[PDB]
Design a binder for this molecule. Sequence first.
Ligand SMILES: CC(=O)O[C@]1(C(C)=O)CC[C@H]2[C@@H]3C=C(Cl)C4=CC(=O)[C@@H]5C[C@@H]5[C@]4(C)[C@H]3CC[C@@]21C
Length: 249
Amino acid sequence: PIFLNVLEAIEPGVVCAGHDNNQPDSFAALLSSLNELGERQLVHVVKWAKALPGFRNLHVDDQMAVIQYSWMGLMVFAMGWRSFTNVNSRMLYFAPDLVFNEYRMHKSRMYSQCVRMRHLSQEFGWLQITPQEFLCMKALLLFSIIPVDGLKNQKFFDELRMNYIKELDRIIACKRKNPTSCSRRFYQLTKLLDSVQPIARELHQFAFDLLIKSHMVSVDFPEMMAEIISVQVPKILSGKVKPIYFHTQ
Ligand SMILES: CC(=O)O[C@]1(C(C)=O)CC[C@H]2[C@@H]3C=C(Cl)C4=CC(=O)[C@@H]5C[C@@H]5[C@]4(C)[C@H]3CC[C@@]21C
């Protein structure tokens, strides 16, 4: 079980936001905490990606680009998994010290996005997604958004993405002998994977908008987050970089 051994081994451990839960649930306090958590996670996201099987095969430039493009989707998906495994998707578990209940969802000003993320988290339960499927799908999300015009080394990327799909295929078939059973599961998993993209798109828009009006005085947005939102996110929003949907949207 080489492939799965690796996925489990490189999976980041718990990361706290450093949020003081005694403070009032203001937009400012929740924003400060979310961003701090964001910057902290990004640190782990980069090391995670670079330790992924075959990732080093990508051109240096494509490595960081791909990481930065899928960043948001990766955080949505993983966050959704933590909510499911920790609080049975009852609340949004961004971190042990930063759990969103109804009031915080409203206070953050991303209530609808949170509700959509809550749905996503519940799909992990309805579909009975295994830790194995979760890990392989999360890795695939890393390879699910690229420039329309292509990456420095597009063929290496396509090769890699294909191999990860093949792995997701092995997972599904490991305990399934009748093809139909397998096809049904693949359908379910690819539909779930797709559903992450629309949510990340809205979060991308929300982040961009906030960065702009925030720049006015408080450019308090962390460094790495600030770089991705000002340099990479617009490429997505303007349509130069797009997600790779499995099914027609
Ligand atoms: C309230 C809000 O706007 O949050 C945002 C901004 C621009 O501040 C917009 C989208 C927010 C991001 C969306 C999610 Cl799913 C997160 C998940 C997660 O596990 C850790 C907490 C972070 C982020 C990446 C969060 C950082 C603050 C963002 C970027």
